[PDB]
Design a protein around this ligand. Structure first.
Ligand SMILES: *[C@@H]1O[C@H](CO)[C@@H](O[C@@H]2O[C@H](CO)[C@H](O)[C@H](O)[C@H]2O)[C@H](O)[C@H]1NC(C)=O
Ligand SMILES: *[C@@H]1O[C@H](CO)[C@@H](O[C@@H]2O[C@H](CO)[C@H](O)[C@H](O)[C@H]2O)[C@H](O)[C@H]1NC(C)=O
Length: 130
């Protein structure tokens, strides 16, 4: 489904995203908005490296989840990319959390760098009571 800004702010809050390894809730809100527009069913296919980005945080099938058709997939999140298209984002979160424990951290999402990095994200969580 498509969350509404403030439903997602509180929901991630409950899942422990605020301050998770130094990443403020607002930063996550920003990359979720630009990567998927708050949609858990979002899916983007890269014809070149035959990989697919899934769900709300647009996590890659070559490095994180398994869809059984991406050449050279390692499945670091030990998850089915399917888990990334269901309405409950519990596993989407458990995985984005694994993603940031890599050397590059939040730099793993280009939308973050383009529209979130150095563009003050205090705007996304203000009014949600988080
Ligand atoms: C987006 O794709 C990136 C490359 O396709 C990916 O970055 C790579 O992730 C690797 C994970 O084992 C490793 O950290 C490499 O150093 C890095 O280049 C990035 O993680 C992907 N982002 C998402 C959200 O899936
Ligand atoms: C999605 O974002 C990823 C990081 O924001 C990006 O992957 C990174 O690309 C770097 C290139 O200098 C380097 O290889 C990093 O190790 C890697 O994680 C990925 O390319 C972005 N998606 C697209 C389609 O560009």
């Amino acid at each position: 489904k498509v969350f509404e800004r403030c439903e997602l702010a509180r929901t991630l809050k409950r899942l422990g995203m605020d301050g998770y390894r130094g990443i403020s809730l607002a930063n996550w809100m920003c990359l979720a908005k630009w990567e998927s527009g708050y949609n858990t069913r979002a899916t983007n296919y890269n014809a070149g490296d035959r990989s697919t980005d899934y769900g709300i945080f647009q996590i890659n099938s070559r490095y994180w989840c398994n869809d059984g058709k991406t050449p050279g997939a390692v499945n670091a999140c030990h998850l089915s990319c399917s888990a990334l298209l269901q309405d409950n984002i519990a596993d989407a979160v458990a995985c984005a959390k694994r993603v940031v424990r890599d050397p590059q951290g939040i730099r793993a999402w280009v939308a973050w760098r383009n529209r979130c990095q150095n563009r003050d994200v205090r705007q996304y969580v203000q009014g949600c009571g988080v």
